[PDB]
Amino acid sequence: KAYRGGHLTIRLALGGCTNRPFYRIVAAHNKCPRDGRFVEQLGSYDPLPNSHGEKLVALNLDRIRHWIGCGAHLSKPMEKLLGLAGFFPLHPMMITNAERLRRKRAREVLLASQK
Amino acid sequence: RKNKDAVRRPQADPALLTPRSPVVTIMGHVDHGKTTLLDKFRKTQVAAVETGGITQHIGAFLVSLPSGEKITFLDTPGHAAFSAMRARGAQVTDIVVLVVAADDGVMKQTVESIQHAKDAQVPIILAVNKCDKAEADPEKVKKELLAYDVVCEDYGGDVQAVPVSALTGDNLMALAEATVALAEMLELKADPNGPVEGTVIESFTDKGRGLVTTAIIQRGTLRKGSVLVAGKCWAKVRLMFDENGKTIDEAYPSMPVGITGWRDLPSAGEEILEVESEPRAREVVDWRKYEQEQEKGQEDLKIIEEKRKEHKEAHQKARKRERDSNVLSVIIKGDVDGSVEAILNIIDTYDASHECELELVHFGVGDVSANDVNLAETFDGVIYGFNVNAGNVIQQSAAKKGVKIKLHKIIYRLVEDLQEELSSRLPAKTSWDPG
Amino acid sequence: KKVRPRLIAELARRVRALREQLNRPRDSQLYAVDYETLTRPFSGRRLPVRAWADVRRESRLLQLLGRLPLFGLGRLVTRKSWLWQHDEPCYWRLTRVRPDYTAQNLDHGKAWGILTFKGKTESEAREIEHVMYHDWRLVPKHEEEAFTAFTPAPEDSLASVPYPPLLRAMIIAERQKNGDTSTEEPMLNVQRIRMEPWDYPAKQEDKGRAKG
Amino acid sequence: FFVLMERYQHYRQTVRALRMEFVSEVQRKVHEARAGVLAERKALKDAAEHR
RNA sequence: AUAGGUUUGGUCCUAGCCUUUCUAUUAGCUCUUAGUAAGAUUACACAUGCAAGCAUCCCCGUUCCAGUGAGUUCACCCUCUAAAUCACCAGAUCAAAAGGGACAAGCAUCAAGCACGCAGCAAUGCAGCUCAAAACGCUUAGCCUAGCCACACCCCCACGGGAAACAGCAGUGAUUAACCUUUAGCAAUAAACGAAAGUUUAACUAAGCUAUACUAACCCAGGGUUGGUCAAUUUCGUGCCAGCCACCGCGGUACAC
Ligand SMILES: Nc1nc2c(ncn2[C@@H]2O[C@H](COP(=O)(O)OP(=O)(O)OP(=O)(O)O)[C@@H](O)[C@H]2O)c(=O)[nH]1
Ligand SMILES: [Mg+2]
Ligand SMILES: [Mg+2]
Ligand SMILES: [Mg+2]
Ligand SMILES: [Mg+2]
Ligand SMILES: [Mg+2]
Ligand SMILES: [Mg+2]
Ligand SMILES: [Mg+2]
Ligand SMILES: [Mg+2]
Ligand SMILES: [Mg+2]
Ligand SMILES: [Mg+2]
């Protein structure tokens, strides 16, 4: 398909089955379907904890660097994943969501104490 | 096979019972002002907007009286043909308003309506209409009704007689007051909870909404998602609508509601019962179809045993055809099951078999379709459409295939055309008469 | 494979291009507005809620320049949004104007000027973006020097920042594997990455145009 | 809002620095594979062996 | 194929047909539960609802996604080089148009096509080019499936005309043997927009229906067959009749109805 415009993006294509999300990190042309063609698969992400209580994430760091150099964008979930991995700085929204959770927890703690 | 049918719930307890609005069916003789009276009560003028000025459909309307009460008026066809429609209206009615023209007095259809009212065991209110015109003799009307057992109050008869003039809208207020009084005396109530019970008043196929049935609720509230079963058909209620087409959230008892989502078109007058779920509804439908199949199988076994005994008698002792000119094959297409049934009853009244046979190849509800044209071609028949459309493509195909599609909008016009065709097939004018 | 011309397709493409060019809508038509419904009549599209007060209160660049000789060429114009956002002076030094004469009051068109943002000028004059916007204000001839008075703060710009933890570890491990004995901290340079606020005017010359 | 805006500014500055580093690495790798001592030596060695 | 039945009075060989195996659709009879996958027969016509916004106005998007298979060697490799991303740049990535090569099935009772080539700056000159190693032609078919090509109501196209368009989701009429909800949510991923918190999304996610399939289970089992190929029939009723058979065949007082 002769795609008018568009650009590469490193994003999480969703696979798995119902109630069992699983992600393939794909450097795919942004306009292509989420589960459609992709230039290269750069790793994986299992959101459901395994028996060891781990959320396995595979990152082909060399290829991710290559595609960032070639100009691929980064979807927000992938940016957050890289921030967690430490490959990138913690996302501002990761930090701000942590702060919001702390404030909500403090409010609920105050409510619980006032009982 | 275990009996998995769905059966009307037993009469509700007085604690469950709750006041419900009355259903009044306006019945009478042709052109005696039933629809005009209904128009006056509804505050809307439809008598002018009619094909042939004839009511050919048992129509329901939820009128609201100025006092604030609500009444479900069923305006029924007055012609001789629609006996089944009149009987069904009498069955579903709580009260029967018999409209009799003061000018013309009692008539054959008036007597038929009185008989149906007696059979349904429903109170009768006489509305003597056309009182304005000279020779209007309500006293004569009452005296003649004495013969048919509709005794007025003046003669010590429980039936209330009301002189009205639907044309001038005079005395209709007192007619409505009498209707309200009779409803109060009847003290109509029904359970507004639990599985729904209703009656199909009409069925049809709408090109946008599917198989649509105009029903009247009898017990419990109907809502989107309820699973209904009626006769051999079932639905998951997809859209409930009113006479105006406005979607309505709930259908309380004695309300006329058009229901969509029927997987098959039910027959007019059949009972609608709510069931638990789709699998249960399909089980009920399969059981009912199986029962009908067993009945038909018993009858077919009788016929087949006749044939086999004949053949065995024949044997033990020893030890395509071109259709005649005097055979009119007809396809029948109606806008509603009621019209289809009326035409079929008219056909079944046929008695001129010797001179020319009248074969009913197929009948249905909806626009003349390619399959109808194919049947007509296969049997050199004629398609008769009652208030249905014949698209341009269908017309072209019928012209190519030599079929004759005859659309009509009046029952007696269609019957005149049918008798014309029978006479044409004859070797002269036909001897069968519709009435 | 023997081709079959798409002659009607090409002809229609050409005719559509010609029609668009010859019926090109005027700027006064494109950027018109209704001050009751707050919708551009030409397209019928509503303006964002956050622009309603500005549309109802402040004025457009050409709507102002219509009252200035030579359209105030050489004057200094500033935007209400800039005034509310930055304490430092920000303005355009008007250098050229191409009004939309078709406009009733010549209250639309294009402008070119030299940008001063955060007290920093721009080397060359370029087109003014957001001319049609409703957040423009005019700098009176007097008070001009006082308003443009400004002295730069010390040039606060970090030379380098720590690498993300995993990247730092990877670089350190690569150095050790190569055998480098350096204990120097690896720092990612940020001087070349000159951050520029989001409200910094964009290159209008490359901006597109509406259609209808 | 203000803390978030500052966080975005710093985050995007650092991310752009990282992206520039990766772009430089990609350019260096391609120019290497194209005309680096290794590739040029191998090409000339192949030509000499062919002769 | 590890083969088997069937030509005849009998044997051998050749050969066709059929049986046994595995899928998928439909139908008949029958059905309890849970997880998951998949789901109009049709490029025929469509009521209704929704499916594209974002945003300090300009821009950007609505060309994407989703859909269908009508058409059909625009899909693959190489050359060249547009558009787009890499904050501006850089060549890098991606990939149009153009050129070269490759690229479905059947019919030769489709054998000739009828200008289908070349040279020259041009003028103009030469009379050539394809083809039984299948040109030209007709019919059929979406393909080479991380997906790709084509179409977007028809007139290939779409200025224009015919006319008023679901081959977007749900749904419907017609049609076929073929027939799922006119559910909820943006909570996740993706896309659009924004500087951003964020907003929109019938993409998608999570649900609804369906023995179409796989997995798992229940202390509530039907369907088919029972002459040989082929596992497995007692007694009656019928008597070349009723009827049965995938093939051979059975039934004239039956392990075949
Ligand atoms: N003289 C007179 N005519 C009336 C009166 N009311 C109605 N009509 C007319 O009588 C005729 C019959 O009225 P309709 O309602 O059409 O007849 P109908 O009795 O319902 O008969 P169907 O067609 O079988 O339904 C029409 O022309 C009416 O306008 C009345 O009070 N007096
Ligand atoms: Mg009437
Ligand atoms: Mg089945
Ligand atoms: Mg095809
Ligand atoms: Mg031939
Ligand atoms: Mg087209
Ligand atoms: Mg269509
Ligand atoms: Mg659809
Ligand atoms: Mg249908
Ligand atoms: Mg199916
Ligand atoms: Mg026997």
Coordinates of C-alpha atoms in Angstrom, one line a residue, chain B residues 109-357:
Chain B
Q109 CA -71.6 -6.9 9.8
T110 CA -73.3 -5.3 12.8
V111 CA -74.9 -8.6 13.7
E112 CA -71.6 -10.3 13.2
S113 CA -69.9 -7.9 15.5
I114 CA -72.6 -8.4 18.1
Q115 CA -72.1 -12.2 17.8
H116 CA -68.3 -11.8 18.2
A117 CA -68.9 -9.7 21.3
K118 CA -71.1 -12.4 22.8
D119 CA -68.6 -15.1 22.0
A120 CA -65.8 -13.0 23.6
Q121 CA -68.2 -12.3 26.5
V122 CA -67.4 -8.5 26.4
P123 CA -69.7 -5.7 27.5
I124 CA -71.1 -3.8 24.5
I125 CA -71.7 0.0 24.3
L126 CA -73.9 1.1 21.4
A127 CA -72.9 4.3 19.6
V128 CA -75.7 5.3 17.3
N129 CA -73.9 7.5 14.8
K130 CA -75.0 9.7 11.9
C131 CA -77.8 11.0 14.2
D132 CA -77.7 14.4 12.5
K133 CA -79.1 13.3 9.1
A134 CA -82.8 13.0 8.6
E135 CA -84.5 9.6 9.3
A136 CA -81.9 9.1 12.1
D137 CA -84.0 6.8 14.4
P138 CA -82.0 5.7 17.5
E139 CA -85.2 4.3 18.9
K140 CA -85.6 2.1 15.8
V141 CA -82.0 1.1 16.1
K142 CA -82.6 0.0 19.7
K143 CA -85.8 -1.8 18.8
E144 CA -84.1 -3.8 16.1
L145 CA -81.1 -4.6 18.2
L146 CA -83.6 -6.1 20.7
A147 CA -83.9 -8.9 18.1
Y148 CA -80.1 -9.6 18.3
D149 CA -80.2 -9.4 22.2
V150 CA -78.5 -6.0 22.6
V151 CA -81.0 -4.6 25.0
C152 CA -80.7 -0.8 25.8
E153 CA -81.1 0.7 29.2
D154 CA -84.4 2.4 28.1
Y155 CA -85.8 -1.1 27.6
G156 CA -84.2 -2.3 30.9
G157 CA -81.1 -3.5 29.0
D158 CA -77.6 -3.4 30.5
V159 CA -76.2 -2.1 27.2
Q160 CA -75.7 1.7 27.2
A161 CA -76.8 3.4 24.0
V162 CA -75.3 6.8 23.1
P163 CA -76.5 8.9 20.2
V164 CA -73.5 10.6 18.6
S165 CA -72.5 12.3 15.3
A166 CA -68.9 11.6 14.6
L167 CA -69.1 14.0 11.6
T168 CA -70.0 16.9 13.9
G169 CA -68.3 15.6 17.0
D170 CA -71.4 16.0 19.1
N171 CA -72.0 13.9 22.3
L172 CA -68.6 12.2 22.0
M173 CA -67.9 13.6 25.5
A174 CA -70.7 11.6 26.9
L175 CA -69.6 8.5 24.9
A176 CA -66.1 8.8 26.5
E177 CA -67.8 9.3 29.9
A178 CA -69.8 6.1 29.4
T179 CA -66.6 4.3 28.3
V180 CA -64.8 5.4 31.5
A181 CA -67.8 4.4 33.6
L182 CA -67.9 0.9 32.1
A183 CA -64.2 0.5 32.5
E184 CA -64.5 1.5 36.2
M185 CA -67.4 -1.0 36.7
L186 CA -65.4 -3.8 35.0
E187 CA -62.5 -2.9 37.3
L188 CA -59.8 -4.0 34.9
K189 CA -56.5 -5.0 36.6
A190 CA -53.4 -7.0 35.7
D191 CA -50.0 -7.9 37.1
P192 CA -47.3 -5.3 35.9
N193 CA -44.4 -7.6 36.8
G194 CA -43.1 -11.0 35.7
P195 CA -42.9 -12.7 32.3
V196 CA -44.9 -10.8 29.7
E197 CA -48.2 -12.0 28.2
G198 CA -49.6 -10.3 25.1
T199 CA -51.5 -10.8 21.9
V200 CA -50.3 -10.2 18.3
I201 CA -52.7 -7.7 16.6
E202 CA -50.7 -7.5 13.3
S203 CA -47.5 -8.8 11.7
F204 CA -45.5 -7.5 8.7
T205 CA -42.1 -7.3 7.1
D206 CA -40.5 -3.8 7.1
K207 CA -37.5 -3.3 4.8
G208 CA -35.6 -1.4 7.5
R209 CA -36.7 -3.1 10.8
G210 CA -37.3 -6.7 9.9
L211 CA -40.2 -8.8 11.1
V212 CA -42.4 -6.3 13.0
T213 CA -45.5 -7.3 15.1
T214 CA -48.0 -5.0 16.5
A215 CA -49.1 -6.5 19.8
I216 CA -51.0 -5.6 23.0
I217 CA -49.6 -6.4 26.4
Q218 CA -51.8 -8.3 28.8
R219 CA -49.6 -9.0 31.8
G220 CA -46.2 -7.8 32.9
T221 CA -44.0 -5.1 31.4
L222 CA -42.0 -5.6 28.2
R223 CA -38.5 -4.1 27.8
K224 CA -35.6 -4.2 25.4
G225 CA -33.8 -7.6 25.7
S226 CA -36.8 -9.6 26.7
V227 CA -37.1 -13.0 24.9
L228 CA -40.6 -13.5 23.4
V229 CA -42.2 -16.6 21.9
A230 CA -45.5 -16.6 20.0
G231 CA -46.7 -19.6 18.0
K232 CA -43.8 -21.1 16.2
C233 CA -41.8 -17.8 16.2
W234 CA -39.6 -16.1 18.7
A235 CA -37.8 -12.7 19.2
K236 CA -35.3 -10.9 21.3
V237 CA -37.0 -7.6 21.6
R238 CA -34.8 -5.2 19.7
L239 CA -37.1 -2.1 19.3
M240 CA -40.4 -1.3 20.8
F241 CA -42.3 1.6 19.1
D242 CA -45.7 3.3 19.2
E243 CA -48.2 4.3 16.6
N244 CA -46.0 7.3 15.9
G245 CA -42.8 5.3 15.8
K246 CA -41.3 6.9 18.9
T247 CA -39.2 4.3 20.8
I248 CA -40.8 3.5 24.1
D249 CA -38.8 2.2 27.1
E250 CA -41.5 0.0 28.6
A251 CA -44.9 -1.5 27.6
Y252 CA -47.4 -1.7 30.4
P253 CA -50.5 -3.8 30.2
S254 CA -53.2 -2.7 27.8
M255 CA -50.6 -0.7 25.7
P256 CA -50.3 -1.2 21.9
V257 CA -46.6 -1.7 21.1
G258 CA -44.9 -2.6 17.9
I259 CA -42.1 -5.2 18.6
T260 CA -39.1 -5.8 16.3
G261 CA -36.6 -8.7 16.3
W262 CA -38.8 -11.7 15.5
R263 CA -36.7 -14.4 14.0
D264 CA -39.9 -15.5 12.2
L265 CA -43.2 -13.7 11.5
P266 CA -46.0 -14.9 13.9
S267 CA -49.6 -15.2 12.9
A268 CA -52.1 -12.6 13.8
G269 CA -53.9 -13.1 17.2
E270 CA -51.4 -15.6 18.5
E271 CA -50.2 -15.3 22.1
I272 CA -46.8 -13.8 23.0
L273 CA -45.2 -15.2 26.2
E274 CA -41.9 -14.1 27.6
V275 CA -39.3 -16.8 28.4
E276 CA -36.0 -16.9 30.3
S277 CA -33.4 -16.8 27.5
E278 CA -32.7 -17.5 23.9
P279 CA -31.9 -21.2 24.3
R280 CA -35.1 -21.7 26.3
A281 CA -37.1 -19.8 23.6
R282 CA -35.6 -21.9 20.8
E283 CA -36.4 -25.1 22.8
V284 CA -40.0 -23.9 23.1
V285 CA -40.2 -23.1 19.4
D286 CA -38.8 -26.5 18.5
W287 CA -41.3 -28.2 20.7
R288 CA -44.2 -26.4 19.2
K289 CA -43.0 -27.1 15.6
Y290 CA -42.6 -30.7 16.6
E291 CA -46.1 -30.8 17.9
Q292 CA -47.5 -29.4 14.7
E293 CA -45.4 -31.9 12.7
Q294 CA -46.8 -34.7 14.8
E295 CA -50.4 -33.6 14.0
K296 CA -49.6 -33.3 10.3
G297 CA -47.9 -36.7 10.5
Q298 CA -51.0 -38.3 11.9
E299 CA -53.1 -36.8 9.2
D300 CA -50.6 -37.8 6.5
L301 CA -50.5 -41.3 8.0
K302 CA -54.2 -41.6 7.5
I303 CA -53.9 -40.5 3.9
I304 CA -50.9 -42.8 3.2
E305 CA -52.7 -45.7 4.8
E306 CA -55.6 -45.1 2.5
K307 CA -53.2 -45.1 -0.5
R308 CA -51.3 -48.2 0.6
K309 CA -54.4 -50.2 1.3
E310 CA -55.6 -49.3 -2.2
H311 CA -52.3 -50.5 -3.7
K312 CA -52.3 -53.7 -1.6
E313 CA -55.8 -54.5 -2.7
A314 CA -54.8 -53.9 -6.3
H315 CA -51.6 -56.1 -6.1
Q316 CA -53.0 -59.0 -4.1
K317 CA -55.7 -59.5 -6.7
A318 CA -53.2 -59.9 -9.4
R319 CA -51.5 -62.7 -7.4
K320 CA -45.6 -34.2 -15.9
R321 CA -49.0 -33.4 -17.3
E322 CA -50.2 -30.3 -19.2
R323 CA -52.4 -28.1 -17.0
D324 CA -55.9 -27.4 -18.2
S325 CA -57.0 -24.0 -19.3
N326 CA -59.6 -23.9 -16.5
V327 CA -57.1 -23.8 -13.6
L328 CA -56.1 -20.4 -12.3
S329 CA -52.9 -20.5 -10.3
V330 CA -52.5 -17.5 -8.0
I331 CA -49.8 -16.2 -5.8
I332 CA -51.0 -14.0 -3.0
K333 CA -48.9 -11.2 -1.4
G334 CA -50.1 -9.0 1.5
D335 CA -48.8 -6.1 3.5
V336 CA -49.7 -7.9 6.7
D337 CA -50.6 -11.4 7.8
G338 CA -54.1 -10.1 8.4
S339 CA -54.6 -9.1 4.8
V340 CA -53.1 -12.4 3.6
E341 CA -55.4 -14.4 5.8
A342 CA -58.4 -12.3 4.6
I343 CA -57.6 -13.0 1.0
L344 CA -57.0 -16.7 1.8
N345 CA -60.4 -16.9 3.5
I346 CA -62.1 -15.2 0.4
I347 CA -60.3 -17.8 -1.8
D348 CA -61.3 -20.7 0.4
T349 CA -65.0 -19.6 0.1
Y350 CA -64.5 -20.7 -3.6
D351 CA -67.3 -23.1 -4.8
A352 CA -67.1 -22.9 -8.7
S353 CA -64.5 -25.7 -8.8
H354 CA -66.3 -27.5 -11.7
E355 CA -66.1 -24.6 -14.1
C356 CA -62.6 -23.5 -13.1
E357 CA -60.2 -24.5 -10.4

